[PDB]
């Protein structure tokens, strides 16, 4: 059993490692840094970047061992600029920035309202209403274009879509972000979210002491972005709280996540509002970029697009129109979302701090070490996925359940997987049902679109789609 | 056992059940 120090490594100097990382690859290509590192060191390595050292793994078999020894209250890497903002400006923290018993308490509360089948079944008509309106927007744009046809970059529209969707299941109220004339304050919120992520990157491998010193301007801009996030989340929650007392009726119809938490949960109001803030901010840039990638992948692979349409048409007929029923009848659609997140993870890595010592690849890794699963590098790895550059949803249907062992990692694992996983799955699946029924998707002068690291992974450049009424 | 508490948000014990299983339920 080899000691920790024997794990392949660029070296022990974190600032030198950081220097070589910045000059050769760059901060916005961290996902490539991982790929190259694995090609250089083999299937496991350690790297100190600035002050933080991680062990990095790629093999689903090492992944399984990692998540096997996970404790009751797991911890992932905390993003230093995010943590500092919350501490210094004393903002209430949600489930994302809590650990141990305080994390569990929020998570358990939130799980009853956000992850539980009994609760999540209520999301269906709320998300469908938004998706149906998105389809209307595009139909309007086709009519207006006068060519039976619409071409355009719909990123901003996908951000507005994702925002209507998360706000609708939380508040049970439409924000009108899919209308022709849009709330400019709600837009200012949507933009702050992207700014928060983008401005995170120059500060990523530095202790807070070095932020204000070498990234003063970035820190300033980062703080302004979180201020918008928090201001408007507070206003939303607070208005909701008072309007509840103004209309005070024990409604029998479903009204949204917030109503349920405020009316019957163990959480304090301040805890609730902290988590409303995080769920809102978490929901805008994640589902939107993933859908964009999906549409891109359907445009790149027209046969696969044809198959998915046929599945959804069959499913709408077989279910005689009912959405709840449809969702149990689209296994290829669900697999295609899994296939989209493999090629295009939102999260470059998953991370866990070990609670106990652990052996991986005959190396001894001591308790409290950060271990990172290189999710991006994994999905591109030709030894772990057959023909990895090919978008093939059937891959997830294979009854050879050796082929999918610890491969579906886009939303993470165990008790501290994505909190918004059901919202995201349901929102994207419903979004794609509606699109597939209404439009054929193409990209004129199609080319390979790469990935940039903006804390979340995002496309490197715009994608201009063409839509045809089906 | 039952760490997420009967919510289908772990695997310490449908299409979503299938996903929790390919990483190895009692509460469903
Ligand atoms: C395609 C969409 C999404 C992807 C791929 C994604 C991915 C992830 C990943 C990889 C994690 C870390 C899981 C782990 O450490 O094991 C995570 C956590 C988290 N996500 Fe998402 N996410 C998505 C959408 C959302 C949405 C819509 C929300 C809003 C509800 C959200 C809110 C959160 C929160 C609060 C956490 C931290 C949970 C905790 O620490 O208990 N995410 N997500
Ligand atoms: C706005 C927030 C309140 C919610 C954001 C949340 O909805 C995200 C986008 O879902 C967050 C939650 C945990 C985040 C990850 C935590 C740790 C790391 C390691 C770091 O090296 C790269 C970023 C990466 C891989 C983060 C990417 C963005 C994630 C995956
Ligand atoms: S208890 Fe979490 S999955 Fe059944």
mmCIF file of C-alpha atoms in Angstrom, chain A residues 33-320:
data_model
loop_
_atom_site.group_PDB
_atom_site.id
_atom_site.type_symbol
_atom_site.label_atom_id
_atom_site.label_comp_id
_atom_site.label_asym_id
_atom_site.label_seq_id
_atom_site.Cartn_x
_atom_site.Cartn_y
_atom_site.Cartn_z
ATOM 1 C CA UNK A 33 -6.151 20.693 -17.791
ATOM 2 C CA UNK A 34 -7.798 17.580 -16.266
ATOM 3 C CA UNK A 35 -7.845 15.651 -19.573
ATOM 4 C CA UNK A 36 -4.183 16.485 -20.229
ATOM 5 C CA UNK A 37 -3.235 15.629 -16.640
ATOM 6 C CA UNK A 38 -4.742 12.133 -16.897
ATOM 7 C CA UNK A 39 -2.991 11.545 -20.237
ATOM 8 C CA UNK A 40 0.230 12.607 -18.468
ATOM 9 C CA UNK A 41 0.000 10.862 -15.053
ATOM 10 C CA UNK A 42 -2.344 7.930 -15.637
ATOM 11 C CA UNK A 43 -5.705 7.261 -13.906
ATOM 12 C CA UNK A 44 -4.905 8.959 -10.571
ATOM 13 C CA UNK A 45 -2.898 12.063 -9.622
ATOM 14 C CA UNK A 46 -2.564 14.804 -6.998
ATOM 15 C CA UNK A 47 -2.172 18.520 -7.601
ATOM 16 C CA UNK A 48 -1.719 21.466 -5.293
ATOM 17 C CA UNK A 49 -3.165 24.573 -6.957
ATOM 18 C CA UNK A 50 -2.358 27.664 -4.894
ATOM 19 C CA UNK A 51 -3.131 26.445 -1.354
ATOM 20 C CA UNK A 52 -5.578 23.639 -2.193
ATOM 21 C CA UNK A 53 -4.413 20.074 -2.849
ATOM 22 C CA UNK A 54 -6.699 17.449 -4.390
ATOM 23 C CA UNK A 55 -6.343 13.860 -5.495
ATOM 24 C CA UNK A 56 -8.007 13.493 -8.900
ATOM 25 C CA UNK A 57 -9.689 10.316 -10.170
ATOM 26 C CA UNK A 58 -11.361 9.328 -13.480
ATOM 27 C CA UNK A 59 -12.155 5.565 -13.188
ATOM 28 C CA UNK A 60 -15.759 4.698 -12.241
ATOM 29 C CA UNK A 61 -14.322 1.874 -10.083
ATOM 30 C CA UNK A 62 -12.350 4.386 -7.931
ATOM 31 C CA UNK A 63 -15.464 6.591 -7.914
ATOM 32 C CA UNK A 64 -17.500 3.697 -6.471
ATOM 33 C CA UNK A 65 -14.987 3.184 -3.664
ATOM 34 C CA UNK A 66 -15.000 6.910 -2.933
ATOM 35 C CA UNK A 67 -18.766 7.196 -2.596
ATOM 36 C CA UNK A 68 -18.857 3.843 -0.756
ATOM 37 C CA UNK A 69 -16.973 5.213 2.265
ATOM 38 C CA UNK A 70 -18.984 8.431 2.324
ATOM 39 C CA UNK A 71 -20.140 9.567 5.787
ATOM 40 C CA UNK A 72 -23.606 10.668 6.973
ATOM 41 C CA UNK A 73 -22.858 14.384 6.252
ATOM 42 C CA UNK A 74 -20.548 14.676 3.172
ATOM 43 C CA UNK A 75 -18.578 17.816 2.268
ATOM 44 C CA UNK A 76 -17.578 18.964 -1.219
ATOM 45 C CA UNK A 77 -15.193 21.769 -2.209
ATOM 46 C CA UNK A 78 -16.487 25.171 -1.087
ATOM 47 C CA UNK A 79 -15.893 28.033 -3.479
ATOM 48 C CA UNK A 80 -13.748 30.597 -1.614
ATOM 49 C CA UNK A 81 -15.119 33.786 -3.211
ATOM 50 C CA UNK A 82 -18.682 32.571 -2.420
ATOM 51 C CA UNK A 83 -17.794 31.721 1.191
ATOM 52 C CA UNK A 84 -15.995 35.056 1.779
ATOM 53 C CA UNK A 85 -18.896 37.089 0.402
ATOM 54 C CA UNK A 86 -21.311 35.395 2.787
ATOM 55 C CA UNK A 87 -19.033 35.766 5.810
ATOM 56 C CA UNK A 88 -17.845 39.322 5.274
ATOM 57 C CA UNK A 89 -21.240 40.766 4.343
ATOM 58 C CA UNK A 90 -23.001 38.430 6.780
ATOM 59 C CA UNK A 91 -25.561 36.953 4.388
ATOM 60 C CA UNK A 92 -27.646 33.985 5.542
ATOM 61 C CA UNK A 93 -26.304 30.731 4.155
ATOM 62 C CA UNK A 94 -28.357 27.942 2.698
ATOM 63 C CA UNK A 95 -27.852 24.236 2.305
ATOM 64 C CA UNK A 96 -24.980 24.822 -0.163
ATOM 65 C CA UNK A 97 -22.646 26.429 2.415
ATOM 66 C CA UNK A 98 -23.577 24.427 5.524
ATOM 67 C CA UNK A 99 -21.900 21.296 6.919
ATOM 68 C CA UNK A 100 -22.731 18.435 9.330
ATOM 69 C CA UNK A 101 -25.913 18.597 11.449
ATOM 70 C CA UNK A 102 -27.031 22.066 10.231
ATOM 71 C CA UNK A 103 -26.780 20.875 6.609
ATOM 72 C CA UNK A 104 -28.779 17.703 7.295
ATOM 73 C CA UNK A 105 -31.565 19.681 8.946
ATOM 74 C CA UNK A 106 -32.043 21.962 5.900
ATOM 75 C CA UNK A 107 -31.552 19.107 3.424
ATOM 76 C CA UNK A 108 -34.172 16.853 5.064
ATOM 77 C CA UNK A 109 -36.669 19.760 5.220
ATOM 78 C CA UNK A 110 -36.044 20.710 1.595
ATOM 79 C CA UNK A 111 -36.064 17.113 0.337
ATOM 80 C CA UNK A 112 -39.696 16.677 1.432
ATOM 81 C CA UNK A 113 -40.674 19.598 -0.835
ATOM 82 C CA UNK A 114 -38.228 19.421 -3.731
ATOM 83 C CA UNK A 115 -36.998 15.822 -4.210
ATOM 84 C CA UNK A 116 -39.975 13.736 -2.956
ATOM 85 C CA UNK A 117 -42.274 12.072 -5.565
ATOM 86 C CA UNK A 118 -45.354 13.206 -3.558
ATOM 87 C CA UNK A 119 -44.233 16.848 -3.857
ATOM 88 C CA UNK A 120 -42.588 16.769 -7.326
ATOM 89 C CA UNK A 121 -45.754 15.441 -9.067
ATOM 90 C CA UNK A 122 -47.201 18.923 -8.447
ATOM 91 C CA UNK A 123 -44.439 20.507 -10.534
ATOM 92 C CA UNK A 124 -45.734 18.954 -13.774
ATOM 93 C CA UNK A 125 -48.419 21.503 -14.789
ATOM 94 C CA UNK A 126 -46.315 24.432 -13.500
ATOM 95 C CA UNK A 127 -43.360 23.493 -15.696
ATOM 96 C CA UNK A 128 -45.532 22.496 -18.655
ATOM 97 C CA UNK A 129 -47.201 25.934 -18.638
ATOM 98 C CA UNK A 130 -43.758 27.596 -19.037
ATOM 99 C CA UNK A 131 -42.592 25.128 -21.736
ATOM 100 C CA UNK A 132 -45.864 25.597 -23.667
ATOM 101 C CA UNK A 133 -45.295 29.377 -23.638
ATOM 102 C CA UNK A 134 -41.695 28.933 -24.811
ATOM 103 C CA UNK A 135 -43.062 27.055 -27.824
ATOM 104 C CA UNK A 136 -45.488 29.982 -28.393
ATOM 105 C CA UNK A 137 -42.602 32.499 -28.385
ATOM 106 C CA UNK A 138 -40.876 30.543 -31.152
ATOM 107 C CA UNK A 139 -44.091 30.160 -33.195
ATOM 108 C CA UNK A 140 -44.459 33.981 -32.949
ATOM 109 C CA UNK A 141 -40.883 34.480 -34.117
ATOM 110 C CA UNK A 142 -41.491 32.133 -37.085
ATOM 111 C CA UNK A 143 -44.643 34.054 -38.097
ATOM 112 C CA UNK A 144 -42.801 37.396 -37.737
ATOM 113 C CA UNK A 145 -39.820 36.144 -39.783
ATOM 114 C CA UNK A 146 -42.115 35.490 -42.760
ATOM 115 C CA UNK A 147 -40.091 32.530 -44.041
ATOM 116 C CA UNK A 148 -41.726 29.485 -42.321
ATOM 117 C CA UNK A 149 -38.645 29.359 -40.277
ATOM 118 C CA UNK A 150 -36.754 30.943 -37.369
ATOM 119 C CA UNK A 151 -32.988 31.319 -36.910
ATOM 120 C CA UNK A 152 -31.338 32.791 -33.880
ATOM 121 C CA UNK A 153 -29.199 32.494 -30.814
ATOM 122 C CA UNK A 154 -31.725 31.650 -28.069
ATOM 123 C CA UNK A 155 -29.361 31.651 -25.059
ATOM 124 C CA UNK A 156 -30.992 34.753 -23.460
ATOM 125 C CA UNK A 157 -34.389 33.126 -24.062
ATOM 126 C CA UNK A 158 -33.203 29.919 -22.446
ATOM 127 C CA UNK A 159 -32.042 31.937 -19.375
ATOM 128 C CA UNK A 160 -35.480 33.615 -19.208
ATOM 129 C CA UNK A 161 -37.130 30.199 -19.638
ATOM 130 C CA UNK A 162 -35.095 28.677 -16.827
ATOM 131 C CA UNK A 163 -36.022 31.680 -14.654
ATOM 132 C CA UNK A 164 -39.811 31.403 -15.298
ATOM 133 C CA UNK A 165 -39.520 27.687 -14.541
ATOM 134 C CA UNK A 166 -37.707 27.893 -11.179
ATOM 135 C CA UNK A 167 -39.826 30.896 -10.092
ATOM 136 C CA UNK A 168 -43.060 29.120 -11.037
ATOM 137 C CA UNK A 169 -42.447 25.973 -8.925
ATOM 138 C CA UNK A 170 -41.124 28.071 -5.993
ATOM 139 C CA UNK A 171 -43.701 30.870 -6.041
ATOM 140 C CA UNK A 172 -46.601 29.380 -8.016
ATOM 141 C CA UNK A 173 -46.663 32.672 -9.949
ATOM 142 C CA UNK A 174 -45.717 33.629 -13.483
ATOM 143 C CA UNK A 175 -43.066 36.371 -13.776
ATOM 144 C CA UNK A 176 -43.917 37.049 -17.435
ATOM 145 C CA UNK A 177 -40.333 36.601 -18.665
ATOM 146 C CA UNK A 178 -41.570 34.920 -21.872
ATOM 147 C CA UNK A 179 -43.764 37.919 -22.865
ATOM 148 C CA UNK A 180 -42.752 40.437 -25.563
ATOM 149 C CA UNK A 181 -42.303 43.152 -22.922
ATOM 150 C CA UNK A 182 -40.235 41.936 -19.994
ATOM 151 C CA UNK A 183 -39.705 42.942 -16.356
ATOM 152 C CA UNK A 184 -36.315 44.754 -16.487
ATOM 153 C CA UNK A 185 -35.696 44.114 -12.755
ATOM 154 C CA UNK A 186 -36.165 40.362 -13.214
ATOM 155 C CA UNK A 187 -33.739 40.554 -16.162
ATOM 156 C CA UNK A 188 -31.227 42.343 -13.910
ATOM 157 C CA UNK A 189 -31.475 39.333 -11.576
ATOM 158 C CA UNK A 190 -30.949 36.807 -14.413
ATOM 159 C CA UNK A 191 -27.815 38.704 -15.559
ATOM 160 C CA UNK A 192 -26.430 38.987 -12.039
ATOM 161 C CA UNK A 193 -26.501 35.203 -11.888
ATOM 162 C CA UNK A 194 -24.228 34.806 -14.909
ATOM 163 C CA UNK A 195 -21.995 37.606 -13.528
ATOM 164 C CA UNK A 196 -21.701 35.834 -10.196
ATOM 165 C CA UNK A 197 -20.344 32.720 -11.990
ATOM 166 C CA UNK A 198 -18.166 34.491 -14.536
ATOM 167 C CA UNK A 199 -16.534 36.710 -11.865
ATOM 168 C CA UNK A 200 -15.890 33.648 -9.696
ATOM 169 C CA UNK A 201 -13.152 32.343 -12.005
ATOM 170 C CA UNK A 202 -10.238 34.773 -11.508
ATOM 171 C CA UNK A 203 -10.475 34.144 -7.746
ATOM 172 C CA UNK A 204 -10.776 30.325 -7.793
ATOM 173 C CA UNK A 205 -7.423 29.005 -6.525
ATOM 174 C CA UNK A 206 -6.557 31.879 -4.170
ATOM 175 C CA UNK A 207 -7.191 32.355 -0.446
ATOM 176 C CA UNK A 208 -9.460 35.339 0.336
ATOM 177 C CA UNK A 209 -6.376 37.292 1.514
ATOM 178 C CA UNK A 210 -5.137 37.429 -2.065
ATOM 179 C CA UNK A 211 -8.530 38.366 -3.694
ATOM 180 C CA UNK A 212 -8.713 41.971 -2.595
ATOM 181 C CA UNK A 213 -5.022 42.296 -3.268
ATOM 182 C CA UNK A 214 -4.748 40.951 -6.834
ATOM 183 C CA UNK A 215 -8.355 40.666 -8.041
ATOM 184 C CA UNK A 216 -9.794 43.805 -6.429
ATOM 185 C CA UNK A 217 -11.824 44.742 -9.514
ATOM 186 C CA UNK A 218 -13.139 41.170 -9.970
ATOM 187 C CA UNK A 219 -14.039 40.927 -6.292
ATOM 188 C CA UNK A 220 -15.828 44.271 -6.462
ATOM 189 C CA UNK A 221 -17.888 43.057 -9.449
ATOM 190 C CA UNK A 222 -18.501 39.684 -7.830
ATOM 191 C CA UNK A 223 -19.863 41.355 -4.654
ATOM 192 C CA UNK A 224 -22.185 43.571 -6.736
ATOM 193 C CA UNK A 225 -23.568 40.460 -8.488
ATOM 194 C CA UNK A 226 -24.389 38.592 -5.252
ATOM 195 C CA UNK A 227 -25.983 41.891 -3.938
ATOM 196 C CA UNK A 228 -28.494 41.799 -6.788
ATOM 197 C CA UNK A 229 -29.116 38.079 -6.172
ATOM 198 C CA UNK A 230 -29.790 38.641 -2.455
ATOM 199 C CA UNK A 231 -31.731 41.894 -2.794
ATOM 200 C CA UNK A 232 -34.274 40.487 -5.213
ATOM 201 C CA UNK A 233 -34.569 37.040 -3.608
ATOM 202 C CA UNK A 234 -35.349 38.848 -0.319
ATOM 203 C CA UNK A 235 -37.924 41.151 -1.991
ATOM 204 C CA UNK A 236 -39.623 38.117 -3.668
ATOM 205 C CA UNK A 237 -39.766 36.012 -0.488
ATOM 206 C CA UNK A 238 -40.836 38.963 1.663
ATOM 207 C CA UNK A 239 -43.631 40.074 -0.696
ATOM 208 C CA UNK A 240 -44.785 36.445 -0.882
ATOM 209 C CA UNK A 241 -44.840 36.188 2.905
ATOM 210 C CA UNK A 242 -47.007 39.246 3.386
ATOM 211 C CA UNK A 243 -49.388 38.546 0.468
ATOM 212 C CA UNK A 244 -49.983 35.140 2.083
ATOM 213 C CA UNK A 245 -51.261 36.936 5.171
ATOM 214 C CA UNK A 246 -53.308 39.313 3.001
ATOM 215 C CA UNK A 247 -55.203 36.500 1.170
ATOM 216 C CA UNK A 248 -54.923 33.972 4.053
ATOM 217 C CA UNK A 249 -56.818 30.909 2.791
ATOM 218 C CA UNK A 250 -56.036 27.216 3.378
ATOM 219 C CA UNK A 251 -55.967 26.554 -0.387
ATOM 220 C CA UNK A 252 -56.526 22.952 -1.467
ATOM 221 C CA UNK A 253 -54.860 23.512 -4.878
ATOM 222 C CA UNK A 254 -51.054 23.284 -5.023
ATOM 223 C CA UNK A 255 -49.346 26.664 -4.659
ATOM 224 C CA UNK A 256 -45.582 26.055 -4.822
ATOM 225 C CA UNK A 257 -42.525 25.132 -2.750
ATOM 226 C CA UNK A 258 -42.440 28.374 -0.700
ATOM 227 C CA UNK A 259 -46.071 28.176 0.396
ATOM 228 C CA UNK A 260 -45.459 24.607 1.587
ATOM 229 C CA UNK A 261 -42.320 25.442 3.539
ATOM 230 C CA UNK A 262 -43.745 28.603 5.161
ATOM 231 C CA UNK A 263 -46.939 26.736 6.062
ATOM 232 C CA UNK A 264 -45.628 23.387 7.289
ATOM 233 C CA UNK A 265 -41.888 22.848 7.785
ATOM 234 C CA UNK A 266 -39.329 22.734 10.573
ATOM 235 C CA UNK A 267 -37.304 25.543 8.963
ATOM 236 C CA UNK A 268 -37.106 29.055 10.337
ATOM 237 C CA UNK A 269 -38.053 31.864 7.950
ATOM 238 C CA UNK A 270 -34.422 32.989 7.666
ATOM 239 C CA UNK A 271 -33.348 29.429 6.770
ATOM 240 C CA UNK A 272 -36.177 29.209 4.253
ATOM 241 C CA UNK A 273 -35.277 32.542 2.604
ATOM 242 C CA UNK A 274 -31.581 31.591 2.453
ATOM 243 C CA UNK A 275 -32.495 28.423 0.537
ATOM 244 C CA UNK A 276 -35.000 30.178 -1.714
ATOM 245 C CA UNK A 277 -32.122 32.468 -2.708
ATOM 246 C CA UNK A 278 -29.879 29.506 -3.604
ATOM 247 C CA UNK A 279 -32.522 27.508 -5.479
ATOM 248 C CA UNK A 280 -33.377 30.588 -7.576
ATOM 249 C CA UNK A 281 -29.761 31.324 -8.378
ATOM 250 C CA UNK A 282 -28.965 27.654 -8.943
ATOM 251 C CA UNK A 283 -31.770 27.209 -11.428
ATOM 252 C CA UNK A 284 -31.148 29.829 -14.094
ATOM 253 C CA UNK A 285 -27.788 28.941 -15.690
ATOM 254 C CA UNK A 286 -27.909 25.173 -15.189
ATOM 255 C CA UNK A 287 -30.994 23.856 -17.018
ATOM 256 C CA UNK A 288 -30.745 26.541 -19.720
ATOM 257 C CA UNK A 289 -27.183 25.704 -20.825
ATOM 258 C CA UNK A 290 -27.903 21.981 -20.660
ATOM 259 C CA UNK A 291 -30.966 22.398 -22.884
ATOM 260 C CA UNK A 292 -28.911 24.464 -25.280
ATOM 261 C CA UNK A 293 -26.394 21.584 -25.462
ATOM 262 C CA UNK A 294 -29.192 19.083 -25.975
ATOM 263 C CA UNK A 295 -30.641 21.102 -28.857
ATOM 264 C CA UNK A 296 -27.132 21.389 -30.274
ATOM 265 C CA UNK A 297 -26.682 17.579 -30.003
ATOM 266 C CA UNK A 298 -30.034 16.978 -31.723
ATOM 267 C CA UNK A 299 -28.974 19.307 -34.519
ATOM 268 C CA UNK A 300 -25.615 17.476 -34.854
ATOM 269 C CA UNK A 301 -27.305 14.061 -35.043
ATOM 270 C CA UNK A 302 -30.497 14.255 -37.076
ATOM 271 C CA UNK A 303 -31.200 10.454 -36.894
ATOM 272 C CA UNK A 304 -31.133 10.635 -33.127
ATOM 273 C CA UNK A 305 -33.420 13.660 -33.301
ATOM 274 C CA UNK A 306 -35.875 11.676 -35.504
ATOM 275 C CA UNK A 307 -35.890 8.759 -32.989
ATOM 276 C CA UNK A 308 -36.580 11.083 -30.053
ATOM 277 C CA UNK A 309 -39.472 12.803 -31.842
ATOM 278 C CA UNK A 310 -41.035 9.399 -32.709
ATOM 279 C CA UNK A 311 -40.764 8.339 -29.064
ATOM 280 C CA UNK A 312 -42.513 11.515 -27.861
ATOM 281 C CA UNK A 313 -45.299 11.377 -30.485
ATOM 282 C CA UNK A 314 -45.912 7.736 -29.512
ATOM 283 C CA UNK A 315 -45.849 8.699 -25.852
ATOM 284 C CA UNK A 316 -48.313 11.565 -26.246
ATOM 285 C CA UNK A 317 -50.731 9.251 -28.085
ATOM 286 C CA UNK A 318 -50.317 6.278 -25.714
ATOM 287 C CA UNK A 319 -50.802 8.572 -22.690
ATOM 288 C CA UNK A 320 -53.882 10.135 -24.290
#
